[PDB]
């Protein structure tokens, strides 16, 4: 009797009745609407608001047109109820599109510009919901709603503020719409609302400004008109709200795309905040902050200040984040940005443990991380004063097998590093040891790169052979007398 399993599996699903968007009920409300009698229309509006409040689905033209018609009313009750109904229906994705196609934006804008704060709230909110569909965003942005949205973002009523700033946020997702926002004058408002004591408003405005900072032109504009923006974001890095912390950090990263902001964030005291955030052991916070410091470390004038601030060891520790490839990449990239600085910073770099950790990661990490590490080694090897030390950390053990990689960032930078390590060093012991190992070591490298199609690789091989000859060493001169090496020409 397996059947009685099935017998109750069906009844169950026959369960999985409150639908009134058609037939009798709908016709009754519609009849109330087209009566053009004020009281009856009030009744219809209240009914619609309640119904949409309790249940929402994709509805047809005949549901939305009586509501749109109710939105032409001068009566506050009708207005607020109809706006509530349309706003509720605008939670469904097909409804958003249909509502905008029917010309709902014009009545909504009109209702926004009236002196009724509840109607303001509901109309703005309806627009907020409409703007969560990509198709609608540009149409809303160019419809004229931006001026009243910007104005209403300054409302003393927190619900109106949330809806307004939310809509503004919903139109920072494309370059064009962001341009529309900046042209409508939203930026001073957003910046001012960075100080808001409401978590939602603060988050919306922080995120909105962060998205606005994605565009170079907006960054330039902000640099000219909003001089205290960096300070405010910096102070927002210490917000008790985690998402506001994270987003403020992201905004600072985005801004740090530019040189001037790279200097300005440091000048405004952002470094200790970043130092703390990069050690939070919260993946979002760490990601944001390591990205930010990655951008900031590009400016030479910051290097010293970054090392004094104590970034090196936190950065090095980030390399143990084996389940976050991006964090590893950014950490290593920042380290490499700190790898060709002054002597003090160099000593600090070597005292951080970056070389050893990078060596450890070089042969057991994603190819992106490998690439960053390889580049880091390549730049580190440029300093003569460091070469021996790099050699005594046995990084040749990493470099040599990396010259086998089909990723040319890896292999190319490994070749560069190795080559430079072979040049003008006082002691060639480590090089002699690594002549045949690992994996044919340095001689094998020389062979393979001597027969390379890519003229740069071949140039590298020839150049490092020359550097090996150039140095006054008796034995490496003995080791180059092997026939696979020489007749290459």
């Amino acid at each position: 009797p397996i059947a009685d399993n099935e017998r109750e599996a069906v009844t169950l699903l026959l369960g999985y009745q409150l639908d009134f968007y058609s037939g009798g009920p709908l016709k009754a409300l519609t009849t109330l609407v087209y009566s053009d009698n004020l009281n009856l229309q009030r009744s219809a509006a209240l009914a619609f608001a309640e119904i949409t409040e309790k249940y929402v689905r994709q509805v047809s033209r005949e549901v939305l047109e009586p509501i749109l018609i109710l939105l032409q009313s001068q009566d506050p009750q009708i207005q607020v109820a109809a706006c509530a109904a349309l706003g509720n229906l605008a939670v469904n994705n097909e409804n958003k599109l249909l509502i905008v196609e029917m010309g709902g934006l014009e009545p909504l804008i009109n209702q926004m510009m009236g002196d009724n704060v509840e109607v303001q709230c509901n109309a703005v909110g309806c627009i907020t919901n409409l703007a969560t569909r990509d198709d609608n965003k540009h149409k809303i942005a160019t419809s004229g709603a931006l001026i009243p949205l910007t104005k209403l973002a300054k409302s003393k009523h927190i619900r109106v503020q949330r809806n307004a700033t939310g809509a503004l946020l919903n139109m920072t997702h494309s370059e064009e719409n962001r341009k529309e926002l900046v042209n409508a004058g939203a930026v001073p408002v957003l910046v001012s609302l960075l100080s808001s004591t409401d978590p939602d408003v603060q988050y919306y405005c922080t995120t909105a400004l962060s998205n606005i900072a994605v565009d170079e032109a907006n960054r330039k504009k902000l640099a000219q008109t909003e001089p205290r923006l960096v300070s405010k974001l910096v102070s927002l890095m210490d917000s008790p709200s985690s998402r506001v912390k994270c987003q403020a950090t992201l905004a600072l990263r985005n801004l740090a795309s530019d040189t001037s902001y790279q200097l300005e964030i440091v000048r405004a005291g952002g470094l200790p905040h970043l130092v703390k955030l990069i050690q939070s052991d919260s993946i979002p916070l760490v990601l944001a902050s390591v990205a930010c410091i990655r951008n900031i470390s590009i400016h030479p004038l910051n290097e010293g200040l970054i090392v004094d601030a104590g970034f090196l060891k936190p950065l090095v520790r980030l390399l143990d984040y084996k389940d976050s490839e991006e964090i590893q990449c950014h950490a290593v990239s920042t380290l490499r940005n700190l790898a060709a600085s002054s002597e003090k910073n160099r000593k600090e770099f070597f005292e951080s443990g970056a070389v050893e950790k990078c060596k450890e990661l070089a042969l057991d990490s994603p190819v992106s991380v490998q690439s960053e590490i390889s580049a880091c080694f390549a730049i580190l090897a440029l300093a003569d004063v460091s070469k021996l030390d790099l050699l005594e950390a046995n990084i040749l053990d990493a470099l040599i097998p990396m010259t086998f990689s089909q990723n040319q960032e890896v292999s190319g930078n490994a070749a560069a590093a190795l080559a430079n390590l072979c040049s003008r060093v006082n002691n060639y012991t480590k090089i002699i040891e690594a002549w045949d190992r690992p994996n044919e070591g340095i001689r094998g490298f020389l062979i393979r790169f001597l027969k390379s199609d890519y003229a740069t690789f071949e140039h590298i091989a020839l150049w490092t052979i020359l550097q090996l000859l150039e140095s006054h060493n008796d034995k490496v001169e003995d080791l180059v007398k092997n026939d696979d090496d020489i007749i290459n020409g």
């Binding site: 109820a81 309806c126 809806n163 390549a378 960032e409």
Partner: peptide, 30 residues
């Protein structure tokens, strides 16, 4: 001829990222 370098000294700046999280309205009173 003094050194070999196949990568830029500094690494590239990251592209600014957009947060695509969407805001929704507050509950509607009527």
């Amino acid at each position: 001829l003094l050194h070999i370098q196949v990568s830029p000294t500094k690494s590239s700046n990251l592209d600014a990222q957009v947060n695509t999280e969407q805001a929704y309205s507050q509950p509607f009173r009527y």
